[PDB]
Design a binder for this molecule. Structure first.
Ligand code: FAD
Ligand code: FAD
Ligand code: A7N
Ligand code: A7N
Lengths: 588, 588
């Protein structure tokens, strides 16, 4: 029990000191340690419930039962007298850097998860290497350190969303007394892209500074695991070599998919290219219906584009379908065209991209609807958003023994461990987990504490709030209504809901009954909240706080007894009362 | 136990039916009452823990143990056969309408709590009248049905706050690529006031419609309690008369104070006058330091006014003072000027309000600083925001026996009951309760259900969240840092904090280390979150959700194990780790 934890902690910790907060010999050892600039983990036995038990168990490794006790890579080094003797004899530096391998930890992939893992592990004295390479898109688009979110994902996408939100703020301003004429104002795409890219550039740079200041080695090279402890690297000059590491963390992300049709790779683009495009897309076709598809089609329309979305089946497969359909109807009412139940067959090039004068080409898209009828229409830009996939064939040799599922994602236990005991996986490539940046970040930091600092806390993957950043945002936490009914039966589900209008929309003469929120509850479990859903402005800021309450098991009564903040949209959750079974209208 | 509840429910309800959902004789009676348009409360014994016990206790009043039993105003009326007999004989309507008093409920005050209480009561059959009258301001300002929040509080101030926010949105849009020029744009006060007042007018009218469609008598007359059940009314022709009611609810609110100095009443204004002012205030002096003073000064400066605030002692007395200071420091950097430790001595008139050309007058304000030095400066408008108070001598005769406190506020027990047993007080005049609009509404609806529907739920006044809508907003829930330390001692308090930067501020080139948040926690109670504080955009939306977790007693561990939504401001609460005790900087 206590003993098995100690054995695991001592085995993989790189440098760790067992200590008591009261002991002056402990403080004497702490003082020598970072004077010599030795980073390490520390466990204060007088602050745990079973410290006396651990103190006893330490003797199984050291033959002594006192504090301080210092360990390096699973080997007892000394008590106070012994460490000080190593210091003043100039022997301490070589003791702490002795290792079977070059690195205590190799991180393959320099994105949200891997950057978080590397930095956290280095703080406890693990010798750490982070590898990141960015394979170019079909047209050659490339970018710097930081991963999918920082460069071609959450960060540029939300800033482009904001430029689109500012469109309606210029309209709203007139009604609130400002003298501008919105009709005489236009948007400059390339000026936006320069500002977005200047921020992304400063994130590239920050992360490089951050690794240097934590003493992490950063190799801008492609990594390939060839055995449990061996990683093969290829640099920018195609020079190949091998480095060894004790623990390996796989965190190499995904990349966009292309449909297997003529013209797609040659003439279409993905989100990987959208966020640094040197020209405005112009008349655009977005193929797909994921959140990526709708977010991108969303702000393109708010900026002035002529935009069409071609939907194979439904919007936001996997989310609550009433909420998804409300999202879609709002977009269709503010300019976005939809070609429903439709798939593409081929893209033909009518004009090559005008790289000189900064203009799009021109394409012919040919498809069919599910009932046979034909689709044929010209566009300037075709954006494919039909899913993402990893390619561990380029990262991982099959003979290494790491097991993958059907989709090609790594099969792990709930501690991120793969089928090779010293190899772990985090982030989008960990099968079954939500594919989100805060999850990758949290999973990576908690793994590093378990490996190198004796921690035990696991990452909790359930009930993770999300927000889709469409022109009217949609935030949610927990089960969709149809999933709640599938799991418990309609008789045991009760849904409270209401429309609402933000106070800001009143003077601006915006829509009365478009925003909507609902609570999906379980009758036989004290009306437990199973899912929260809200469509409206600032939905991510609204939802986040309630995720803490849901993680705690909140009921409808918890929502009833809490008082609202006035005036806000979020307060509507505190006085909800109309049920779906009652058939009363939710309009206001 | 059960017995004293049933006695209380039966004595107080106006029309109540004890039923079971499974009984066809009950459905038969429900139908007859519906058809005759008789409103009533219902208690379904087959859905109560001790419904079998209650069934037996009903016999104390009716001599029967069966279902249904209908009561009117404490008196048993009959079972199924007896009710249908009264119906078939055209006797029912005079039986339900007979009463010792004119009304079951008289509400004095047609505002937040007042209207909420009256509408809820009428739903369960109680015959209800609501009285409202708006005593003019010194310069003659008057408004319609709805109370302070609707007409001269939360609703008009937050709309004017929103017009201020739009000035920075116009600035930001250039950076996101919009071709406007903020430098060549101005603001029209009268245009904004017209939009605000029109939305208010639609609320005035909606409230009256709501009372009519709930069968509530609305009397636009001044009411006065002269004895426990007698209310004297004086209409708009100064006709005087008397009405009587069983239950009485006082809900008359407060109005602004003036300081006892020459010229203040004659030449200054207050928030009562500012939201319908026909002319822009121009160069404005705001006297006081409340959230009223700071919100109004904040939006006046954002709409281009030259604004000064005079502060007797501190900003936002009673709020966390670290946060108060961050609030004012932001306002001071963005335009607002402050005369600190200063009080006014007299207001002298130099120009009269030019009522033709729609222009302010001109004042000379004289006063002194706390050390002795002298303040003298001219202003076009002077706004007093130095507190609010009730004046129950206008409303309630001292001979009735309703105990007041030293501040003129009504002393009640934890169920809103005064010292006269049939009279209650809700909202801003209830002594010691937080003076907010959603509190008053909850107090009113919950009280009406205890009086007329047999409910037991009390209002929970603890840990109610707030938001101050200064140009950078401040939201809070629970104790200030100073209050928490004083109550448990510095050794037992841990504080986690951090700065942040909204992602919307990056491309707009706004400040880096101005937004801020902290969690104030008790070490010896499992790191329980005692108070939450955030300064930043959309602070109300951010804060609302966390109040449900705090009502449930969240700990730091609950925040840690919950995942964030990215990219949002609110997610910074899910990864806090820097402590104040440690000395590590909170900048990013
Ligand atoms: C358009 C878009 C918008 C999104 N918006 C959001 C949002 O608002 N919120 C949210 O939570 N999530 C969002 N996501 C999801 C988010 O991007 C991912 O969940 C997140 O990036 C997960 O990061 P990761 O650590 O799993 O891998 P990544 O961030 O993809 O990093 C992996 C890195 O490893 C590199 N790599 C691959 N192979 C090798 C190799 N052999 N050697 C070296 N390096 C290699 C890759 O090039 C990449 O840089 C969005 C995604 C997309 C595509
Ligand atoms: C400038 C300002 C801004 C505010 N902003 C907010 C905010 O953002 N959020 C928030 O939660 N709270 C806010 N408040 C506070 C909130 O408006 C009050 O707490 C709330 O309106 C009080 O409710 P009430 O029902 O107790 O009284 P009121 O709303 O004042 O209603 C009482 C009514 O009774 C009438 N009356 C008085 N005497 C008589 C009589 N004898 N006969 C008949 N009628 C009578 C009054 O004229 C008035 O119409 C603000 C207050 C002010 C002044
Ligand atoms: C705990 C060692 O890691 C493992 C990883 C995956 C699996 C199974 C689920 N494929 C088993 C063990
Ligand atoms: C139930 C109403 O009883 C009351 C008893 C006491 C007080 C204060 C004055 N002590 C108020 C109401």
């Amino acid at each position: 029990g206590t003993s098995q934890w100690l054995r695991k902690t001592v085995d993989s910790a790189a440098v760790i000191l067992f200590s008591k907060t009261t002991c002056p010999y402990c403080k004497k050892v702490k003082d020598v340690l970072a004077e010599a600039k030795i980073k390490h983990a520390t466990i204060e036995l007088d602050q745990l419930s079973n410290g006396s038990a651990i103190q006893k168990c330490l003797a199984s490794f050291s033959k002594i039962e006192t504090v301080p006790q210092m360990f390096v890579r699973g080997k007892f080094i000394g008590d106070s007298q012994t460490v000080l003797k190593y210091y003043s004899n100039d022997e301490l530096a070589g003791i702490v850097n002795e290792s079977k391998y070059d690195y205590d930890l190799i991180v393959i992939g320099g994105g949200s998860g891997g950057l978080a893992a590397g930095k956290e592990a280095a703080k406890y004295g693990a010798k750490t290497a982070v590898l990141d390479y960015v394979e170019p898109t079909p047209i050659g688009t490339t970018w710097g350190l930081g991963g999918t979110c920082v460069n071609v994902g959450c960060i540029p996408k939300k800033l482009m969303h904001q430029a689109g939100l500012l469109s309606h703020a210029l309209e709203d301003a007139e009604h609130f007394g400002w003298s501008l004429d919105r009709s005489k104002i236009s948007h400059n795409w390339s000026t936006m892209v320069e500002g977005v890219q200047s921020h992304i550039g400063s994130l590239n740079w920050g992360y490089k500074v951050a690794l240097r200041d934590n003493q992490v080695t950063y190799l801008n090279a492609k990594g390939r695991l060839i055995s449990p402890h061996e990683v093969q690297i290829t640099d920018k000059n195609q020079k190949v070599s091998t480095i060894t590491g004790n623990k390996i963390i796989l965190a190499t992300g995904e990349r966009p998919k292309y449909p297997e049709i003529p013209g797609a790779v040659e003439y279409g683009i993905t989100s990987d290219d959208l966020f640094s495009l040197p020209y405005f897309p112009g008349k655009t076709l977005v193929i797909g219906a994921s959140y990526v598809a709708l977010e991108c089609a969303g702000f393109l329309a708010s900026l002035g584009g002529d935009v069409t979305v071609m939907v194979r089946s439904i919007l936001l497969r996997g989310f609550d379908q009433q909420m998804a359909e409300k999202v879609g109807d709002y977009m269709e009412n503010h300019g976005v065209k939809f070609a429903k139940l439709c798939v593409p067959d081929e893209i033909k090039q009518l004009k090559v991209v005008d790289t000189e004068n900064n203009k799009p080409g021109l394409l012919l898209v040919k498809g069919h609807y599910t009932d046979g009828k034909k689709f044929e229409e010209e566009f300037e830009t075709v954006i494919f958003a039909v899913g993402r996939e990893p390619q561990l064939s380029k990262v991982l040799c099959e003979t290494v023994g790491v097991k993958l599922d059907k989709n090609g994602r790594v099969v792990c236990t709930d501690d991120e461990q793969t089928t090779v005991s010293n190899v772990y996986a985090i982030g989008d490539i960990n099968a079954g987990k939500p594919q989100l940046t805060p999850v990758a970040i949290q999973a990576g930091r908690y793994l590093a504490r378990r490996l190198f600092a004796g921690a035990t806390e696991l990452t909790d993957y359930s009930n993770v709030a999300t927000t889709v950043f469409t022109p009217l945002e949609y935030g949610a936490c927990g089960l969709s209504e149809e999933d709640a009914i599938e799991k418990y039966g309609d008789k045991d589900i009760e849904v409270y809901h209401s429309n609402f209008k933000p106070l800001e929309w009143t003077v601006a003469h915006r829509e009365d009954n478009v925003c909507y929120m609902k609570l999906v509850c379980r009758k036989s479990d004290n009306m437990r909240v199973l899912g929260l859903h809200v469509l409206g402005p600032n939905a991510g800021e609204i939802t986040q706080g309630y995720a803490v309450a849901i993680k705690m098991g909140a009921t409808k009564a918890d929502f009833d007894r809490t008082i609202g903040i006035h005036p806000t949209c979020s307060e509507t959750f505190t006085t909800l009362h109309v049920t779906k079974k009652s058939g009363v209208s939710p309009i206001v």
